[PDB]
């Protein structure tokens, strides 16, 4: 048995059947003799490769296996890896190293000081000291990505290892089951339950690790029993709660004073599967107002440590949420009132307001639609106007790194073939990972890409306003033809310059068998 | 309120009342105005400082706070930190940085690229970007050390920060409670319980995290109910089980084939709070023999990932052990038979066999004695001949780094004033952290230090034999007077050149009110 | 030919005949079959090992080869390595790694993420990917330490590599000669020469790289021709100039305003082989006063980049100094006047003033004495009172890390057997690397150790004053018997409680054939 054979046996035994990658010389000895039960998804740039794997990993709730070329390939993917870290995405990142004999003289394609390259974004980074170690290194990689808190890992492999004899004792790796499905002990759980039952005006804040766990239904159960309003934590990479449920209060303000003021009057605030908290607007003030106690359930020690206030419990979100919801008493308090219908905004038969685009998608798109967002100006309106009833219905770059939603959209669609993926992407964001379009076309992945063309980096023009920053160059991105780029990568090119054109374009893309791009003319503020 | 005042309020509110350190210029602004409710333990070298803190941390089962000087002080402690990593010791390591204005030009005492220095040994390493951040950084440090898996952390602080205004919102830090007291969910725990109840010839292996958790009594309960033999995992940094209990099988062989052969016939092998496994002799073969399934409970994802075989569960050892022992059925199988009494070895009235020294200590030393071991030749005999009935009765350098047991002995004794600490230290090991003796004397810490003088690095002469390595220089360490060194640091100097002299010396040291060193003439093999 | 044989052939062919080390399991396969033409110097702790190598490297002006054990040994030496960085000391640091088969499971003595450990202090850190690479890695290590700027390097080697077949093509390594003996091109050198010739009131500042280059005589030539005063740069790790030469102005003040004021009136200030500048007192003000231009010749890009003012030239100090001194014109200006004789200080027949100790050493000690200083309170007086006529006559911890001068003293003495080494070490500093004494005794190295016992960390009591920091714990170190510690390691123990006792003790130590320690009772300020 070779290192090659043993590695592919371990992958399949660990439930991996897919390889996301961009090939190169150092990967050919791993990629040759490709098993019939595996499939390779090619992307044209390593940002795109990882972004696709990311979406696939996040929607599947399983490890995604990546294979990149040396330093240059790993490097090209580092922005994408910055999103995977905050996402807690289980990404197994492998990269071909030059032969052991050639590393010393630093021959072309040598990854110098390989394990340092992807730091500090990965939970684990390693290059084995012998070819027989490679399978054992892969085992650690697989388990390091899948254990709470989940995240990207990095394995560098000299290309001459693949053909060498595997250690026969590597077979003990194949069926290893590692569990982190843990929850607070009975004594301390009862105390926390007793404090939730005796809370007067309880409040709940939910983050991406709830949607990752598919703890959504258990959190609905909890919010009903406690009769408590539910917010999503700021800079939300995912949606952990039905957005039209009576308890849902929508997206939290990203400011310190704003959140404290919001939370004032709530005696107990239970945060689940979110950092405390991903602020971005610097709006200073009190973290919490007097009378408000905060308890945080997180899968990430880092999150527990950095919280500027409140108690924390480090545990698996599924296990905690399941236990919390079954143990908690039924309050005789009244269920909070559903949020009102959004205002229909003023719309002429010219350029489309984003508010109009979102209303149209809510009306036309399937009830089990999956949305992705890289339209940075319009995030608030999209959370208000899209009714997302089910889990895994929203993805947004977790560390704010643009070039996620386009490839990720393809990865989600591949992971969820029965669910229509609709990526709403700003004219600016579309360019970062534009070559990802090709993959949707080559593997007939029917992702819909909705380009919001306001001819500008709108979120930055807004930020410059708040900052009162004038004479900033490079805020405008005119002279981009998105129908020409879609055609460039073999993706069907529709347009919508008005409401009737958007209704018809949408209707067309829904029933289209392949990927469709819709270039939307939107109002420039 | 200054950063100084807020930091000392957070320490005391987080339960810290002691500072282990060696001072320097960059630490004076932190160390000035020293609160009455705190105490400073001075050591003369930073290896000694950390080793003392380590012992104190390990015996107390609480964070120990350290304060060292810049790069040079941190650097001097790095060997000691290598032991703390494997130990899972909650060590809060702080180090004075030069003023923010002086860092740029790299003025004398500037710690260049500070957070990188102690990597890769620490769980967390940081230098704050502003003086107002320091308290928040300390909060993260405290929680990063105390959360499972416990371990050393590193905070670098520019010395001009201490006097600056603290952020008033830092008060939210003071009372933060972070829990990792977690255990496997009911459904998967029941499955594991069902497999332990239905095991034919169950086996148990215990590691240092059991003694850390004080999970010892729960593991005795478990071994009785399962009627199963109990080994300690190899390179044991601690003792997790009464060594004269009917089930105790002693220390495991550190080889692959040896352990597999040992485990052959055991259908289920439950490992708790140990890596799988800390081999040192390279004796190759099968990891496990057919018919043997391995389940590992560990507090450390790293341990779970790197295990070359078996299932793993990442959770708190106290919570897992408590749950396992109460849920498990009472087997109607017969309790395993106590191990035989050790053979008394041949002894004349000249140089002492280590076997004799250990028999003498077992007879004379209190039932609740705490032992430390840095006598690398004689570890096996010491495990066989010392009856350790209680928790926290054994410490041994976890990563094998010499210069731990002498300072650690002082730290344990300070943490456990009602328990006689007896450090059995080889002539070789004694030198690494020799200046630690002074601290025992300056703070009247009645640690007994037993120096095994065979005039050589015995373990290395043995290793060179196994390797058949000849003409190795520097294996012998003649011409060391340990009574002169003890006097050098104000520690009472006894000797034992025969059995009667060892009996009387021991009797004297037991009733001595201060630290005693006993130089023992032992047989050179 | 094995990796072992080829490595020892490369060392000897590269001019290495000495191994400084503390052994362990992972080093036995390198250390076995020790060649007859090599010698091993054992130290009892890795701080001591490196400190000895450091002194030897600095006095010899050649690479020193070190061999430590895994993480714990490397770690123990990290403080010492922090001094070697600022020193630009050519230290080849090797450390035994566990076998390639055992690294994966992290068996006892495994150095985890080995090359990261000694960062950020080393110029180069590496673990080879194959046993056949080891010789090539050693070649890089040797050349990376010896090229300007010189500094410590780190090589980690799995212990099973040593016995494996070497690549025959490794023979090309043996005789490789790498040169950095470079100087500014003629056109730019002429411009700089023209600006030195046309300078009105030129000034010269010299640093440790001048003494490293043995550029001392060329810098005397330069100072005579320019008729310019010569200072030594602050925090001086070495002495680059005869201290009783008419031009010598002594040690510079370590403050910004102080140095600028000092330099005011000097139209051109030429700094050679020094950082610009190693400030420690934060005394703010102007870096340079108007009318003062600064030109810096340094061997270190880092030094060139971080200078807050002036022009820099990155080149070899020997080559630059030699060229500068031969090209420069003979000024018809008058030679600066020799500094006055120091004041004899008030002395009774009780405890000795440091001023008295230094006057006594100047009178009695040989003209070609080598001094080392770890008496942190008394540095200024020692520079004023010791006439150092020759190169390599002064060493002081370069990064201020205590535990350098005691081992370094032994290394210097071994490198310079015809020159009496006299280490003046504070009561505090003596403890950091106290076990180094044994090596002086075991290899009969006749280093004289002069312990300045004021029973305190004097420099820290002074610093706390300047800072007006009160109630600082751990500033006092009473109850240390240094004659007992010397005896402990077999070193002859003299004392001096008054002047007559110091005169006689000194006279005795000078003619003693082995190491002598002199415990001096000094006045506590
Ligand atoms: C890789 C990367 N580069 C730059 C940014 C900064 N950034 C945040 S939003 C934004 C503008 C995006 O514009 P567009 O996609 O047109 O959306 P709009 O703001 O107009 O809705 C930019 C450049 C980033 N987050 N990531
Ligand atoms: C810091 C460090 N340096 C070196 C070693 C390697 N080492 C392991 S055991 C040993 C010998 C210790 O001798 P001693 O304390 O006399 O005990 P003995 O073997 O004679 O019982 C050495 C040097 C180590 N583990 N740590
Ligand atoms: C490893 C290390 N720890 C601590 C310090 C801080 N420090 C600088 S000088 C000093 C006091 C040294 O005292 P001693 O050797 O007695 O000399 P004195 O000041 O009394 O002359 C200390 C601890 C340091 N530089 N390096
Ligand atoms: Mg835009
Ligand atoms: Mg010994
Ligand atoms: Mg002193």
Contact call for residues C21 and C30 (beta carbons, < 8 A): no
Residue numbers of C annotated as active site: 24-25, 27, 46, 69, 280, 400
Q: How was this structure determined?
A: X-ray
Residue B174's SS3 state is: coil
- Residue-wise over B396-431: b if at least 16 C-beta within 10 A, else e? bbbbbbbbbbbbbbbbbbbbbeebbbbbbbbbbbbb
d(CA B18, nearest CA chain C) in Å? 12
Q: Which of B329, B375, B437 shows the shortest CA–CA distance to B45?
A: B437
Chain gaps in chain B, named by the residue before each (C–N > 2.5 Å): none
Catalytic residue, candidates A15, A25, A350, A500: A25
For A341, residues 6+ apart whose C-beta sits below 8 A from its C-beta are none
Residue A27 annotated as catalytic: yes
Q: Which of A420, A405, A422 shows the shortest CA–CA distance to A520?
A: A422
Query: How much distance in Å is there from the Cα of C523 to the middle of ligand 3?
Result: 17
Torsion of CA B74, B77, B80, B84, to 10 degrees: -20
End-to-end CA distance of chain C: 63
Instruction: Give dist(CA A21, CA A394) in Å, integer.
Output: 25
Instruction: Give dist(CA C280, CA B449) in Å, integer.
Output: 41
Query: How long a stretch of residues is chain A?
Result: 525
The position carrying tokens 């819709």 is A518
- Residue-wise over A351-371: b if at least 16 C-beta within 10 A, else e? bbbbbbbbbbbbeebeeebbb
From residue B206, alpha-carbon distances to B19, B210, B213 in Å are 32, 7, 12
Identify the helix (H) or strand (E) that includes residue A158: strand A153-158
The C-alpha R_g of chain A, in whole angstroms, comes to 24
Instruction: Give dist(CA C232, CA C209) in Å, integer.
Output: 11
* Ranges of H-type helices in B204-293: 208-213, 216-226, 256-263
Whose atoms come closest to the Cα of B462: which ligand?
Answer: 2
Identify the helix (H) or strand (E) that includes residue C220: helix C216-226
Which subunits sit against C, judged by 3+ Cβ pairs under 8 A? A, B
DSSP E strand stretches across B307-433: 311-314, 370-374, 394-396, 421-426
Contact call for residues A90 and A57 (beta carbons, < 8 A): yes
Chain B residues inside the 8 Å CB shell of A166: none
The angle formed by the CA atoms of residues C293, C297 and C303, to the nearest 5 degrees, is 95
Query: How long a stretch of residues is chain B?
Result: 525
Contact B301 A185 (CB under 8 A): no
Chain A residues inside the 8 Å CB shell of B124: 305
Q: Please tell me if the CB atom of residue B458 comes closer than 6 angstroms to any atom of ligand 2.
A: yes
CA-based nearest residue in chain C for residue A115: C113
Residue B350 CB coordination number (10 Å): 10
What are the residues facing A424 on neighbouring strands?
A373, A450
Residue C13 CB coordination number (10 Å): 14
Q: What is the CB < 6 Å shell around ligand 1? A: A 79, 374-378, 400-403, 426-429, 432, 452, 454, 456-460
Instruction: Give dist(CA B24, CA B31) in Å, integer.
Output: 10
- Best probe of the A interface among C130, C141, C160, C167, by most A CBs < 10 A, is C130
Chain B residues inside the 8 Å CB shell of A181: 184-185, 188
From residue C347, alpha-carbon distances to A121, A345, B334, C357, C504 in Å are 64, 94, 84, 11, 17
Q: Nearest residue CA, atom 22 of ligand 2?
A: C24
Contact C130 A100 (CB under 8 A): yes
Instruction: Give dist(CA B52, CA B46) in Å, integer.
Output: 10
Instruction: Give dist(CA C122, CA C109) in Å, integer.
Output: 22
Instruction: Give dist(CA A411, CA A59) in Å, integer.
Output: 8
SS (H, E, C) A438-486: HHHHHCCCCCEEEEEECCECHHHHHHHHHCCCCCCCCCECCCCCHHHHH
User: What is the number of helices (H) and of strands (E) in chain B?
Assistant: 20, 20
CA B142 centroid distance within chain: 19
Axis-axis angle for helices C134-146, C3-13 (nearest 10)? 20
- Best probe of the C interface among B406, B431, B443, B476, by most C CBs < 10 A, is B431
Residue C280 CB coordination number (10 Å): 18
DSSP E strand stretches across A299-341: 311-314
Residue C281's SS3 state is: coil
| Backbone φ and ψ of C46, nearest 5° | -75, -25
Instruction: Give dist(CA B276, CA C394) in Å, integer.
Output: 52
How is chain C split among helix, strand and coil, in percent rounded to 5? 40, 20, 45
d(CA B336, nearest CA chain C) in Å? 30
- Best probe of the C interface among A129, A130, A168, by most C CBs < 10 A, is A129
Instruction: Give dist(CA A243, CA B219) in Å, integer.
Output: 48
- Cis status, amide bond into C120, omega within 30 of 0: yes
Q: Which of A243, A263, A419, A274 shows the shortest CA–CA distance to A339?
A: A243
Q: Please tell me what DSSP assigns to residue C131.
A: G
Chain C residues inside the 8 Å CB shell of B434: 434-435
Query: How much distance in Å is there from the Cα of B459 to the middle of ligand 2?
Result: 7
DSSP E strand stretches across A159-200: 178-179, 182-184
Contact B310 A172 (CB under 8 A): yes
Contact call for residues C406 and C437 (beta carbons, < 8 A): yes
Residue B325's SS3 state is: helix
For A270, residues 6+ apart whose C-beta sits below 8 A from its C-beta are A196, A202, A203, A204, A205, A222, A228, A295, A297, A324
d(CA A100, nearest CA chain C) in Å? 6
Residue A24 annotated as catalytic: yes
Residue C232's SS3 state is: strand
| Backbone φ and ψ of C244, nearest 5° | -115, 15
Residue A312's SS3 state is: strand
Contact call for residues A354 and A343 (beta carbons, < 8 A): no
HSE of C45, CA atoms in CB hemisphere, 13 A: 39
Chain A residues whose C-beta sits inside 8 Å of any chain B C-beta: 124, 136, 139-140, 143-144, 147-148, 169, 172-173, 176-185, 188, 286-288, 301, 304-316, 319, 322-323
Contact call for residues B135 and B164 (beta carbons, < 8 A): no
What are the residues facing C494 on neighbouring strands?
C518
CA-based nearest residue in chain B for residue A169: B286
For B275, residues 6+ apart whose C-beta sits below 8 A from its C-beta are B207, B233, B298, B300, B303, B306, B307, C106
Residue C193 CB coordination number (10 Å): 18
The angle formed by the CA atoms of residues C496, C499 and C501, to the nearest 5 degrees, is 40
Contact A129 C100 (CB under 8 A): yes
Which subunits sit against B, judged by 3+ Cβ pairs under 8 A? A, C
Tokens of A172: 């003990």
Long-range CB contacts for residues C226-229, cutoff 8 Å, separation at least 24: C226/C196, C226/C199, C226/C202, C226/C328, C226/C331, C227/C202, C227/C331, C227/C333, C227/C334, C227/C335, C227/C336, C228/C202, C228/C203, C228/C204, C228/C270, C228/C336, C229/C203, C229/C204, C229/C336
| Backbone φ and ψ of B313, nearest 5° | -135, 120
To what resolution in angstroms was this structure determined? 2.3
What is the DSSP annotation of C248-273? Answer: EEEEPPSSHHHHHHHHTT-SEEEEES
CA-based nearest residue in chain A for residue C98: A129
- Residue-wise over C489-523: b if at least 16 C-beta within 10 A, else e? bbbbbbbbbbbebbeebbeebbeeeebbbbbbbbe
Q: Which of B18, B14, B65 shows the shortest CA–CA distance to B175?
A: B14
| Backbone φ and ψ of B344, nearest 5° | -70, 130
Instruction: Give dist(CA C509, CA C514) in Å, integer.
Output: 8
Contact call for residues A307 and A296 (beta carbons, < 8 A): yes
CA-based nearest residue in chain C for residue A98: C129
Q: Nearest residue CA, atom 4 of ligand 2?
A: C24
Contact call for residues C358 and C386 (beta carbons, < 8 A): yes
Tokens of C107: 């068996």
Identify the helix (H) or strand (E) that includes residue A70: helix A70-76
Tokens of C404: 């350098």
* Ranges of H-type helices in C293-378: 301-306, 317-327, 354-364
Instruction: Give dist(CA B248, CA B230) in Å, integer.
Output: 5
CA A314 centroid distance within chain: 21
Q: Please tell me if the CB atom of residue B453 comes closer than 6 angstroms to any atom of ligand 2.
A: no
Tokens of C11: 């060392």
Strand order in the sheet with C39-42: C39-42, C18-21, C64-69, C91-97, C153-158, C124-126
Instruction: Give dist(CA C478, CA A30) in Å, integer.
Output: 66
Taking the CA atoms of B477, B478, B483 and B486 in sequence, report the sign of the dihedral they define. negative
Contact call for residues A153 and A92 (beta carbons, < 8 A): yes
Contact call for residues B80 and B401 (beta carbons, < 8 A): yes
Residue B13 CB coordination number (10 Å): 14
CA A184 centroid distance within chain: 27
Instruction: Give dist(CA C18, CA C11) in Å, integer.
Output: 9
Taking the CA atoms of A108, A110, A112 and A114 in sequence, report the sign of the dihedral they define. positive
From residue C315, alpha-carbon distances to A365, A422, C145 in Å are 69, 61, 16
Instruction: Give dist(CA B155, CA B356) in Å, integer.
Output: 46
| Ligand 2 probe mutation, B402, B408, B432, most atoms within 8 A of CB | B402
Taking the CA atoms of C359, C362, C364 and C370 in sequence, report the sign of the dihedral they define. positive
What are the residues facing A2 on neighbouring strands?
A165
For B348, residues 6+ apart whose C-beta sits below 8 A from its C-beta are none
What is the DSSP annotation of C479-513? Answer: ---HHHHHHHTT-EEEEESSHHHHHHHHHHHHH-S
Contact call for residues A312 and A188 (beta carbons, < 8 A): no
SS (H, E, C) C138-161: HHHHHHHHHCCCCCCEEEEEECCC
SS (H, E, C) C105-123: CCCCCCCCCHHHCCCCCCC
Contact C133 A103 (CB under 8 A): yes
What is the DSSP annotation of B272-320? Answer: ESS-S----S---S-SS-TT-EEEEEES-HHHHHH-SSSEEEES-HHHH
- Residue-wise over A238-265: b if at least 16 C-beta within 10 A, else e? bbbbbbebebbbebbbbbbebbbebbee
Instruction: Give dist(CA B215, CA B209) in Å, integer.
Output: 8
Residue C253 CB coordination number (10 Å): 16
Question: What count of CB pairs under 8 Å joins A to B?
Answer: 134
DSSP E strand stretches across B178-247: 178-179, 182-184, 203-206, 230-232
CA B293 centroid distance within chain: 30
For A108, residues 6+ apart whose C-beta sits below 8 A from its C-beta are A98
Strand B248-251 and strand C268-272: the pairing is unpaired
Instruction: Give dist(CA B266, CA B201) in Å, integer.
Output: 5
The position carrying tokens 């890795």 is C46
Instruction: Give dist(CA B324, CA B199) in Å, integer.
Output: 14
Strand order in the sheet with B311-314: A178-179, B311-314, B293-298, B268-272, B203-206, B230-232, B248-251
Q: Which atom of ligand 2 is nearest to the CA of B400?
A: 25
Contact B183 A183 (CB under 8 A): yes
Contact A130 C105 (CB under 8 A): no
What is the DSSP annotation of A116-136? Answer: GTTTTT-SEEE--SSGGGHHH
Q: Which of A200, A161, A156 shows the shortest CA–CA distance to A6?
A: A161
Domain boundaries, chain C: 1-178, 179-340, 341-525
For A142, residues 6+ apart whose C-beta sits below 8 A from its C-beta are A10, A11, A14, A16, A63, A92
Taking the CA atoms of C367, C371, C375 and C381 in sequence, report the sign of the dihedral they define. positive
Tokens of B482: 């340990």
The position carrying tokens 């090309």 is C172
Chain A residues inside the 8 Å CB shell of B173: 308-309
| Backbone φ and ψ of B496, nearest 5° | -140, 105
Contact B179 A307 (CB under 8 A): no
Is residue A116 exposed (0-12), middle (13-18) or buried (19+ Cβ within 10 Å)?
middle
What is the DSSP annotation of B66-116? Answer: EEEEHHHHHHHTHHHHHHHHHHT--EEEEEEEPPHHHHTTT-TT--TTGGG
The position carrying tokens 């010491």 is B382
């Amino acid at each position: 048995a070779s290192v090659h054979g043993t590695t592919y046996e371990l992958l399949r035994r660990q439930g991996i059947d897919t390889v996301f990658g961009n090939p190169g010389s150092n990967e050919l000895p791993f990629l040759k003799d490709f098993p019939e039960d595996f499939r390779y998804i090619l992307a044209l740039q390593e940002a795109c490769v990882v972004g696709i794997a990311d979406g696939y990993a996040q929607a599947s709730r399983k490890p995604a296996f990546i294979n990149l070329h040396s330093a240059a390939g790993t490097g090209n993917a580092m922005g994408a890896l910055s999103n995977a870290r905050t996402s807690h995405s289980p990404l197994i990142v492998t990269a071909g190293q030059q032969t052991r004999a050639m590393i010393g003289v630093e021959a072309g394609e040598t990854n110098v000081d390989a394990a340092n390259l992807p730091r500090p974004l990965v939970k684990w980074s390693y290059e084995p000291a012998s070819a027989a170690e490679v399978p054992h290194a892969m085992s650690r990689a697989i388990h390091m990505a899948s254990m709470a808190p989940q995240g990207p890992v990095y394995l560098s492999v000299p290309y001459d290892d693949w053909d060498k004899d595997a250690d026969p004792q590597s077979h003990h790796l194949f069926d290893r089951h590692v569990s982190s499905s843990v929850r607070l002990n009975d004594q301390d759980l009862d105390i926390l339950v007793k404090a939730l039952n005796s809370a007067s005006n309880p409040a709940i804040v939910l983050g991406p690790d709830v949607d990752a766990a598919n703890a959504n239904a258990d959190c609905v159960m909890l919010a009903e029993r406690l009769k408590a309003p539910v917010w999503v934590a700021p800079s939300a990479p995912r949606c952990p709660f039905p957005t039209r449920h009576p308890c849902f209060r929508g997206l939290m303000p990203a400011g310190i004073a704003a959140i404290s003021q919001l939370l004032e009057g709530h005696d107990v605030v239970l945060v689940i599967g979110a950092p405390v908290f991903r602020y971005h607007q610097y709006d200073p003030g009190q973290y919490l107002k007097p009378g408000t106690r905060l308890i945080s359930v997180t899968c990430d020690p880092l999150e527990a440590a950095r919280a500027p206030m409140g108690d924390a419990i480090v545990a698996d979100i599924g296990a905690m949420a399941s236990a919390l919801a079954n143990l908690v008493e039924e309050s005789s308090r009244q269920l909070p009132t559903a949020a009102p219908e959004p205002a229909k905004v003023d719309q002429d038969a010219g350029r489309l307001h984003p508010e109009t685009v979102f209303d149209t998608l809510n009306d036309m798109a399937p009830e089990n639609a999956i949305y992705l967002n890289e339209s940075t100006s319009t995030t608030a309106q999209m959370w208000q106007r899209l009714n997302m009833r089910n889990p895994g219905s929203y993805y947004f770059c977790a560390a704010g790194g643009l070039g996620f939603a386009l490839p990720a959209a393809i990865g989600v669609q591949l992971a969820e073939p029965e669910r229509q993926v609709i990526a709403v992407i700003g004219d600016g964001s579309a360019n970062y990972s534009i070559s990802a379009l090709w993959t949707a076309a080559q593997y007939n992945i029917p992702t819909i890409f909705v380009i919001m063309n306001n001819g500008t980096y709108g979120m930055l023009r807004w930020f410059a306003g708040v900052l009162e920053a004038e004479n900033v160059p490079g805020l405008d991105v005119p002279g981009i033809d998105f129908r020409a780029l879609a055609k460039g990568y073999g993706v069907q090119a529709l347009k919508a310059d008005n409401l009737e054109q958007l209704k018809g374009s949408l209707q067309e893309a829904l029933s289209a068998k392949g990927p469709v791009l819709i270039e939307v003319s939107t109002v420039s503020p």
